Write a protein that binds this DNA or RNA. Structure first.
Ligand SMILES: Nc1nc2c(ncn2[C@@H]2O[C@H](COP(=O)(O)OP(=O)(O)OP(=O)(O)O)[C@@H](O)[C@H]2O)c(=O)[nH]1
Ligand SMILES: [Mg+2]
Ligand SMILES: [Mg+2]
Ligand SMILES: [Zn+2]
Ligand SMILES: [Zn+2]
Ligand SMILES: [Zn+2]
Lengths: 43, 138, 133, 114, 263, 49, 83, 559, 159, 168, 196, 65
RNA sequence: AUCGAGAGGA
């Protein structure tokens, strides 16, 4: 439940990347595998 | 009391941070079996503790540092398919589908971060005895 | 179906090469200069230090399935302790004449050189190996 | 939903013998015996007691498929001397040592305190 | 005596540590494998809920009851439900119990296995007694009730064996070992620098000789001498455990000699 | 143990997922390849609070 | 149109496709109580018996292999090398 | 695209799949509850009323049973219902839809079906437990695990349709690849990692086990083989009894780099007539390889002969392994102390030789190389410098692994994993990269806010000096993370591009079939190739044969 | 660049040669320049090799280029296949695209051309240009639900 | 030298010398007629295409061609009587077998190679990603140089990513 | 699966007898193949398992935290002192025979999770039955006992074998088998068939 | 969820000890490594049955009906 | 049952 309440979806240059400005705001390894991978992140 | 600041990613740009809030300040024989750390003396603010980059399902991972990251990720998607005691109040909630594990057990290795995630008190698995062995071939 | 060869050999090197049971043995021939030997001896069953002298008979007798014993007491040693069973394959060459044999005792091999040749050695399928003292 | 009933590991079903005998199609004076509803508590014990007999050429068994706990045993013995008898004779060797086991245990159980 | 030479060194009400000299390995193994599984006990195997307002759902408690240790010493003269001649269950095959408790106290009413009441005629044999090892006298916490929650039940218990469920084992934990010094070389040690500094020296070294450096390896020497400890759950006292083991092992060993004569 | 934060609707619970967007009112410089007419474009998403 | 008895330049072997389709088209034939030709050793499968009718070429059917242009080439199973 | 070229189909089944080493290659472990439901119309011939009347009586519950009987008039007869289900006279010519018995033709595929291989005809063995069960060596060409991978199964309705599966699609016939001219199915995992242990010269077995292993191969002639040793103890060799599985008339010759008809290190391979002469047996031989055993046995009479082998190898190897056992520990990534020193100084010099090439670019001249210009540049230079510092440490942590190191075994066998796998586990994980270039600068002129702006050194652009056994540092951790994501990205997206590349290729050739004059045409009659593959040869039957007329000296030609 | 070469003595010995690597494409005139071997000149661009050196050099460029994608790091597909792919792209005249544009026009049966990438407009013109469909492809008899002239249906069967 | 070629010879050779094994030192019984006039005749009845007019029988030889140079080199007199020491019976076999081997290696008229000429092609690619990964760095070349470069080769790419010219 | 992406389904269940066991008589709950280790890189799983052992004997709850000074070589010292060897292992005896396993096994407690997906929720079988109205094709989903879709890519594979009659069956007698009346001239579906 | 009767791995009774375990941890104040031992729990499989157990029924009991 | 949304599995 915890990891679902704090979810973050993004609509639609390189997007599903884990980018340097994610450090400590988004989780670098939490994200669904396939389908909408790398878009929808967790806090 | 001017002890903590809140910093966002835009403001992050003009700052220097230390890990390890200690590692990483003080003055200048050591274990060979322990890991290898890198090190500027012009810092702005220390990070609290590295392990806080993690989210929820990731902080359930023991020794995530000792693991190949694509697996850490694979575990995250599975932690939320785990089976346990999702609430105490289930016995009067009329939700479609809820599973409870017959006999839950707190893990044996615990990331400090589980105490705030309240894992130890509402587990989702069992410390079962594992035998890394070839046997029948099943 | 009779005894074949027999000679006296001397240990020149014992190389414990990446194994614990079954070692390689390099032996030279007694009296006869024109001969060398490399052989695979289970050292966990029959010890061999450096400069040991040995005895080496061949033979090929002592369908039919393989029985256990039933002692009775056929035959065949007391004075030959280390016994193996194997197969002949390819036959060498070097001088003309001489000339060498190849033996596989179920994976543990044997190379033997020299001219007698013989021809009281067969191209053939059998092959025993007996070693005493 | 598909799982076999738990008692199908010792309950012998209808038209099922605890022993079947068929001679080996290939070698002479040998038998393959179908031990039904049993594991290798019996499988191991019979076999490694068919070895101490020097009148037996061949002795071995296999757990065909851990799904159906029933093993087969192959026995080849010296010409004339029937294999069925081999099994018979070997079985008694176990019993006797076992019969002793009861006594010798009880002897030394009796003497101890707590 | 004639064959197997058993020797004890420590024995208790619940533990039986002993040597086992001059026997073939196959037996030693055939022995424990009976002790684990094939020896009969009694345990709950038909529960019938009348009222349960606990936070524990019905088949949960039910499941738990099966497990609870039940005195089985006189179990030999009791018949299997399958082998009997009655309908469902009777008094020559099944021992019924009864559990009743009701939250009266405002402060957490427990239920224990003491609270189990025999109901069927015992015939007059030692069988089906909730076993207490508990210091205080209350054997194994079954369930918890609050303020006004009821648990009314009707357990039936039948004869059974471990192959049909783990509840029917008087097993516990079987310790097993031979050749603490690797004389027979049945195993080869995983090492980093040196075998003896990196593995431990076993509990079973006293009364077994070290091999001595320069002595060549013995090829034909076989497995004699085993070091066993057999714990009991309490359903059958420790001595009878090992005994019936041998017995049933022999029992169905005999069943082949009988069936082979029927051929 | 329930920490709340969901909207109870028709007898089911519902969660709002953070929706992500590019931040307005910042000046951003874009190219922009140029076969194609143009080679450089400055863009600003402008909206009031 | 059609090719005469001579002038045969098609592969004189049974293509696995001709095999399966001939074994098959006999299958349904056997399975629908139509007369069976060879001595049935003791089998009863429309799929095993036909494998025997192909061992001793006793299948009265004829392939008709169509060529890209339209004209066809005959060949019976009695005439074909099975391999 | 979805209702004509992709039809929803009846008579089909779907389940989790599990491994079963006691099944045969051409088999399929169909669960009973599916077997209850999946039917097959069969006409009533005087051949088969015996078995069939019985079958109706059994009804739709006892496994050898049936649903539905169909009449002369076109009337349908339900069997779970109907008040005459307990008899019915069976006429000649009646369809009696029935449950699937054992040894029946069925197609058994797995999506994504990127083959003809991912669709194979099987032989049905009805089994309890609800899992679909398949032979461990048919695992490779479906590309299936048992971590919950889900497979599907279909069932013919005409006998000619049956014939069409079991003749052309049956697993045996599909052994050697009409795509890569080398057999796709090999001895994998438990079997392959023990076929090596077995075979080691060092390893022997005696009577009690030997006598059993024999009784494990079903086509055993009852002829004990004569032990390679009859000294103070009677023993066979690991090699010895394996040969029992190797069928009579089989011949294989190898030679590796270190192979001397002796083979001190027991290299390469020599097999004469179903008996192993010398050499360790592994993935080069017993595997899905080119010049391996499986190839040889298949092309030499025949298909099913070779397929019956796969099983008998396993059944024995498993059995030996079962009693010998095998595992893997944390000590199996531990390396010698004074060698992890030797890896830290291997990095330290490779690091302090980056600092050389670095203090040039800053200098800069530079010898700014001519192309290799640059910037291409120094940012390619250090990529190799670190990818070197890894593959030396990976090797320096392979010598350290003694013969007993539970990991090296699985590598030497090739059961799973290899060099890199060890490298990372024992030495250092290496330079993680993004789109083929070391961690990109996200923050302005820096990678993270733990570094100072403009840090082109390894420790900042994503090089992890540590191993997994030491546990990465946070700075590093994120970078390895950064990359990992990138592999999963294309597992959902770059996968499209590919599977689209295919869907085209498929549709663009499609009807390109070899016609009955060996000319390769389309639907109109256009010629594309005149002889298929310019030699009229099916790829399956083709082997890598050396043309020894090309190499060598003029003198080496004459004599 | 290394290269194996006939050493008049008989053996293949390794011959080191200087070769020039370019980041630009203009074959039309590079090969005409004095000092080079205008028999070994190779641009990775097969589109230009086609117009300069004729369709038959392209047949061999296209291939060699698919080879350098597939069979680099260990991969192996038997010549037959890539060459089969290559041939299809080559006989219609120019270089036929593996897209809706190319092969989804060449006077094929409309129904089969229908089951690809453009769908409706293809039928729309079929009804317009009043096309007659051959009924000889794989797709055709699938959409028409028949025994398509494929593997086991290359032939009919009579008596 | 090492190339894909139908029917292993090197095998039917070792399958010869252990089936009638000769083997030593103990000489052959075929005339240099039996050897040389035989090979040329086998070379005649090997076949891939069959016919009676001139164009066919010419493309016929122009398919066997390569295979033969292999046949011609291993069934060459010196070797057939020196390294392998065959006999009239075991040679006649090697002949009757290589033929019998061959015409089993025909492509069957029916084979759908268009689809096979797929997958194949469009196979590993998918699972040479969609593996995909494993696991970390670097990782490809293959799938990034790459699988996009293949998207070029089939679209008929004019806007070419990396145009490169190699002069000799 | 455990806590490191270690998915695997039960392939078989052996009772406490046939199961291997230790000289103390510890019987393992769970046997994973040492083949999904290196593969697969997941070295922590090993560490967790080692730490947990210590945690269980000493009573103390182990510290599995990420970026901390904890060594395997530091666990090894603590497990060494507890009567077992420093890198996990334990001499095990095969259960079928009682003969010592010739290799040492790695053995210990590792927190395993039970994920959903269970065979008896997935198992689907269909032959004939209920079908849609729009297509007369079999409906979707095991929820309404529907058929599987033999997708385009599935067709492709069949053509590669050249299962002719098979495709006719798998796209006729197992989906749509409609019978229309066509004109010998105006060849469309308008004919009135007054029958029978 | 209430201490289990007996342990999954061994089989030893473990239920009876939950009552005593709290008492050895809190009444006379000890660490667990001693506490599990006096309780006769030597083998670690049966050791984890109690150390690792979390007793949820408590918070189930706090509920009213 | 149809159209539409999302989550997960390989
Ligand atoms: N079509 C398709 N197939 C997928 C997708 N994701 C995974 N797969 C398939 O499922 C497999 C996933 O890997 P696994 O089967 O689990 O095997 P693995 O490489 O060892 O990875 P793990 O076992 O999960 O650690 C791949 O081999 C793919 O064939 C996907 O998004 N689309
Ligand atoms: Mg998988
Ligand atoms: Mg997997
Ligand atoms: Zn009764
Ligand atoms: Zn009309
Ligand atoms: Zn326990």
């Amino acid at each position: 439940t915890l990891s679902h309440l704090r979810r973050t979806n993004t609509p639609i240059a390189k997007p599903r990347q884990l980018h340097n400005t994610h450090w400590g705001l988004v989780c670098p390894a939490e994200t669904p595998e396939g389908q909408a991978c790398g878009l929808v992140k967790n806090l | 009391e001017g002890l903590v600041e809140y910093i966002d990613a835009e403001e992050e740009e003009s700052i220097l941070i230390a890990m390890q809030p200690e590692d990483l300040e003080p003055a200048e024989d050591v274990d060979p079996a322990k890991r290898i750390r890198v090190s500027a003396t012009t810092f702005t603010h220390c990070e609290i503790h590295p392990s806080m980059i993690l989210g929820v399902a990731a902080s359930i991972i023991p020794f995530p540092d000792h693991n190949q990251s694509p697996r850490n990720t694979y575990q995250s998607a599975m932690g939320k398919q785990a089976m346990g005691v999702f609430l105490t109040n289930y016995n009067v909630r009329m939700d479609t589908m809820a599973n409870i594990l017959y006999y839950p057990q707190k893990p044996l290795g615990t990331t400090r971060a589980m105490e705030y995630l309240k894992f130890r008190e509402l587990p989702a698995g069992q410390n079962a005895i594992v035998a890394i062995a070839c046997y029948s071939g099943y | 179906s009779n005894t074949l060869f027999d000679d006296i050999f001397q240990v020149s090197e014992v190389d414990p090469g990446r194994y614990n049971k079954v070692c390689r043995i390099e032996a030279a021939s007694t009296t006869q200069d024109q001969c060398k030997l490399t052989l695979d001896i289970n050292v966990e069953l029959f010890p061999v230090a450096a400069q040991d002298s040995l005895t080496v008979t061949i033979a090929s007798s002592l369908t039919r399935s393989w029985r256990p014993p039933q002692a009775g007491d056929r035959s065949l040693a007391d004075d030959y302790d280390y016994v193996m069973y194997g197969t002949a394959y390819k036959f060498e060459e070097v001088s003309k004449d001489l000339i060498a044999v190849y033996y596989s005792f179920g994976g543990l091999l044997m190379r033997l050189e020299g001219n007698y040749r013989n021809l009281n050695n067969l191209k053939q399928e059998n092959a025993y190996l007996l070693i005493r003292r | 939903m598909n799982a076999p009933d738990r008692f199908e590991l010792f309950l012998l079903g209808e038209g099922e013998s605890k022993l079947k005998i068929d001679p080996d199609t290939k070698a002479p004076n040998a038998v393959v015996i179908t031990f039904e509803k049993e594991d290798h508590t019996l499988g191991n014990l019979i076999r490694a007691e068919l070895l101490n007999d020097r009148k037996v050429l061949f002795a071995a068994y296999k757990v065909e498929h851990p799904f159906f706990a029933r093993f087969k045993l192959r026995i080849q013995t010296t010409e004339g001397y029937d294999p069925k008898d081999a099994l018979k004779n070997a079985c008694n060797s176990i019993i006797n040592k076992l019969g002793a086991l009861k006594t010798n245990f009880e002897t030394e159980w009796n003497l101890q305190t707590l | 005596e004639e064959g197997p030479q058993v020797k004890i060194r420590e024995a208790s009400k619940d533990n039986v540590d002993f040597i086992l000299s001059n026997v073939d390995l196959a037996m030693a193994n055939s022995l424990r494998r009976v002790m684990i599984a094939e020896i009969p006990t009694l345990a709950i195997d038909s529960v019938e809920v009348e009222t349960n307002t606990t936070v524990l759902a019905d088949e949960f408690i039910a499941h738990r009851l099966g497990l609870i240790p039940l005195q089985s010493m006189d179990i030999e003269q009791l018949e299997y439900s399958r082998d009997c001649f009655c309908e469902d269950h009777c008094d020559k095959c099944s021992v019924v119990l009864t559990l009743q408790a009701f939250g009266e106290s405002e402060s957490t009413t427990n239920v224990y296995s003491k609270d189990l009441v025999i109901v069927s005629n015992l015939m007059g044999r030692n069988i089906g007694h909730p076993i207490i090892q508990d210091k205080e006298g209350n054997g194994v916490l079954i369930c918890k009730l609050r303020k006004g929650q009821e648990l009314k039940l009707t357990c039936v218990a039948k004869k059974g064996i471990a192959k049909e469920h783990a509840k029917w084992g008087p097993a516990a934990a079987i310790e097993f070992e031979y050749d603490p010094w690797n004389k027979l070389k049945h195993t080869d040690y995983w090492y980093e620098q040196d075998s003896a500094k990196e593995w431990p020296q076993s509990k079973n070294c006293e009364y077994e000789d070290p091999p001595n450096e320069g002595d060549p390896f013995d090829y034909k020497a076989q497995a004699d001498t085993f070091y066993m400890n057999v714990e009991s759950v309490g359903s059958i006292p420790v001595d009878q455990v090992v005994v019936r083991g041998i017995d049933t092992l022999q029992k169905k060993v005999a069943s082949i000699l009988l069936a082979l004569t029927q051929m | 143990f329930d920490m709340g934060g969901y909207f109870i609707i028709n007898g089911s619970e519902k969660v709002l997922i953070a929706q992500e967007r590019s931040a307005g009112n910042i000046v951003q410089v874009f190219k922009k390849a140029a076969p194609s007419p143009i080679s450089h474009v400055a863009e600003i998403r402008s909206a009031l609070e | 149109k059609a090719i005469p008895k001579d002038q045969r330049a098609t592969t004189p072997y049974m293509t696995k496709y001709e095999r399966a389709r001939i074994l098959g088209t006999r299958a349904l034939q056997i399975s629908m109580n139509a007369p069976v030709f060879v001595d049935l050793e003791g089998e009863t499968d429309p799929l095993r018996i036909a494998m025997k009718e192909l061992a001793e070429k006793k299948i009265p059917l004829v392939i008709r292999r169509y060529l890209p242009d339209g004209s066809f080439e005959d060949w019976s199973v009695e005439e074909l090398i099975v391999d | 695209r979805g209702n004509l070229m992709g039809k929803r189909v009846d008579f089909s089944a779907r389940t989790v799949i599990s491994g079963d080493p006691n099944l045969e290659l051409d088999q399929v472990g169909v669960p009973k509850s599916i077997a209850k439901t999946l039917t097959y119309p069969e006409v009533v011939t005087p051949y088969n009323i015996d078995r069939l009347t019985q079958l109706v009586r059994n009804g739709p519950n006892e496994h050898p049973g049936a649903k539905y009987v169909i009449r002369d008039s076109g009337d349908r007869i339900d069997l779970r219902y109907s008040k005459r289900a307990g008899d019915i006279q069976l006429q000649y010519g009646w369809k009696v839809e029935r449950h699937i018995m054992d040894n029946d033709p069925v197609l058994f595929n797995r999506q994504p079906s990127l083959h003809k291989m991912s669709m194979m005809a099987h032989r049905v063995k009805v089994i309890p437990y609800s899992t679909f069960r398949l032979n461990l060596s048919v695992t490779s060409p479906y590309n299936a695990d048992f971590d919950g991978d889900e497979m599907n199964l279909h069932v013919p309705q005409s006998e000619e349709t049956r014939a069409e599966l079991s003749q052309l699609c049956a697993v045996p016939l599909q052994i050697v690849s009409p795509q890569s001219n080398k057999p796709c199915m090999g001895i994998v995992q438990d079997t392959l990692c023990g076929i090596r242990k077995l075979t080691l010269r060092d390893t022997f077995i005696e009577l009690d086990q030997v006598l059993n292993m024999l009784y494990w191969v079903p086509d055993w002639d009852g002829v004990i083989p004569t032990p390679a040793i009859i000294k103070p103890k009677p023993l066979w060799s690991g090699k010895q009894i394996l040969s029992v599985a190797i069928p009579n008339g089989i011949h294989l010759q190898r030679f590796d780099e270190g192979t001397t008809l002796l083979s001190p290190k027991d290299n390469g391979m020599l097999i004469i007539d179903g008996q192993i002469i010398f050499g360790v047996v592994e993935k080069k031989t017993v595997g899905s390889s080119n010049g391996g055993l499986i190839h040889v046995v298949t092309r030499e009479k025949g298909p099913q002969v070779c397929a019956k082998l796969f099983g008998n190898i396993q059944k024995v190897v498993n059995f030996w392994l079962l009693h010998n056992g095998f595992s893997t520990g944390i000590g199996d990534t531990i390396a010698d102390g004074p060698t992890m020193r030797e890896i830290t100084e291997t990095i330290a010099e490779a690091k302090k030789k980056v600092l050389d090439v670095t203090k040039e670019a800053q200098a800069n001249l530079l010898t700014a190389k001519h192309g290799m210009t640059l910037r291409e540049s120094f940012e390619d230079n250090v990529v190799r410098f670190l990818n070197e510092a890894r593959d030396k440490a990976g090797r320096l942590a392979e010598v350290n692994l003694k013969d007993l190191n539970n990991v090296k075994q699985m590598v030497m066998a090739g059961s799973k994993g290899s060099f890199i796998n060890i490298a990372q586990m024992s030495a250092c994980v290496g330079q993680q990269s993004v789109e083929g270039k070391r961690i990109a600068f996200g923050f302005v002129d820096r990678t993270l806010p733990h570094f100072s702006k403009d840090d082109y050194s390894p420790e900042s652009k994503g090089f992890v000096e540590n191993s997994y056994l030491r546990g990465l540092t946070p700075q590093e951790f994120f970078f390895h993370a950064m990359g990992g994501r990138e592999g999963l990205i294309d597992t959902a997206v770059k996968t499209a591009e590919t599977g689209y590349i295919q869907r085209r290729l498929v549709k663009a050739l499609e009807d390109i079939m070899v016609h009955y004059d060996n000319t390769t045409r389309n639907s109109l009659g256009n010629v594309i190739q005149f002889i298929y593959g310019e030699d009229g040869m099916d790829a399956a039957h083709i082997e890598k044969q050396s043309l020894d007329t090309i190499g060598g000296s003029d003198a080496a030609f004459e004599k | 660049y290394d290269r194996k070469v006939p050493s008049p003595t008989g053996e293949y010995v390794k011959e080191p040669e200087w070769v020039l690597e370019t980041d630009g494409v203009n074959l039309s005139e590079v090969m005409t320049v004095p000092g080079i071997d205008p028999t070994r000149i190779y641009t990775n661009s097969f589109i230009d090799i086609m117009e300069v050196l004729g369709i038959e050099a392209g047949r061999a460029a296209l291939y060699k280029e698919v080879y350098n994608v597939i069979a680099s790091d260990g991969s192996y597909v038997n010549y037959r296949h890539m060459a089969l792919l290559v041939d299809v792209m080559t006989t219609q005249g120019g270089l036929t695209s593996v897209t809706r544009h190319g092969f989804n026009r060449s006077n094929t049966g409309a129904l089969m051309r229908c089951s690809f990438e453009e769908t409706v407009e293809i039928l729309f013109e079929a009804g317009a240009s009043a096309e007659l469909d051959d009924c000889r492809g794989v797709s055709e008899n699938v959409i028409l639900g028949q025994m398509a002239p494929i593997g086991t249906g290359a032939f009919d069967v009579m008596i | 030298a090492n190339w894909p070629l139908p029917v292993n010879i090197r095998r039917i050779i070792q399958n010869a010398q252990q089936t009638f094994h000769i083997d030593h030192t103990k000489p052959s019984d075929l005339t240099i007629k039996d050897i040389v006039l035989g090979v040329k005749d086998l070379q005649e009845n090997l076949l891939v295409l069959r016919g009676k007019n001139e164009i066919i029988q010419n493309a016929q030889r122009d398919a066997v061609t390569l295979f033969c140079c292999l046949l011609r080199s291993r069934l060459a007199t010196r070797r057939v009587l020196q390294e392998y020491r065959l006999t009239k019976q075991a040679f006649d076999w090697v002949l009757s077998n290589i033929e019998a081997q061959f015409l089993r290696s025909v492509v069957h008229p029916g084979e759908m190679v268009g689809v096979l000429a797929a997958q194949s092609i469009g196979e590993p690619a998918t699972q040479m990603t969609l593996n995909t990964f494993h696991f970390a760095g670097v990782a490809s070349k293959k799938v990034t140089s790459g699988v996009p470069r293949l998207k070029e080769i089939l679209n008929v790419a004019k806007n070419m990513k990396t145009p490169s010219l190699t002069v000799y | 699966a455990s806590r490191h992406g270690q998915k695997g389904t039960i392939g078989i269940t052996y009772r406490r007898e046939d199961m291997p066991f230790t000289a103390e008589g510890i019987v393992p709950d769970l046997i994973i193949n040492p083949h999904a280790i290196p593969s697969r890189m997941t070295v922590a799983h090993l560490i967790e398992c080692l730490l947990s052992k210590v945690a269980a004997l000493s009573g103390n709850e182990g510290d599995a935290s990420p970026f901390t000074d904890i060594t395997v070589e530091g666990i090894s010292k603590l497990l060494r002192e507890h009567g077992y060897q420093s890198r996990g292992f334990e001499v095990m005896y095969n259960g079928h025979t009682g003969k010592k396993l010739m290799a040492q096994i790695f053995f210990g407690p590792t927190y395993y999770q039970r994920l959903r997906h269970m065979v008896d929720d997935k198992i689907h079988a269909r032959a004939r039955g209920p079908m849609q109205v729009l297509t007369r094709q079999p409906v979707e989903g095991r929820s309404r006992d529907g058929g599987l879709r033999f997708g385009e890519m599935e067709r492709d594979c069949m053509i590669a074998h050249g299962a002719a009659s098979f495709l006719k069956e798998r796209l006729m007698e197992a989906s749509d088998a409609f019978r229309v009346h066509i004109c010998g001239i105006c060849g469309l579906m308008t004919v009135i068939a007054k029958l029978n | 969820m209430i201490v289990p009767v007996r342990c999954f791995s061994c089989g030893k009774v473990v239920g009876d000890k939950w009552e005593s375990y709290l008492n050895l941890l809190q009444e006379d104040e000890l660490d667990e490594g001693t506490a599990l031992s006096r309780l006769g729990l030597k083998r670690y499989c049966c050791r984890r049955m109690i150390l690792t157990h979390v007793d949820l029924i408590e918070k189930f009991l706090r509920y009213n009906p």
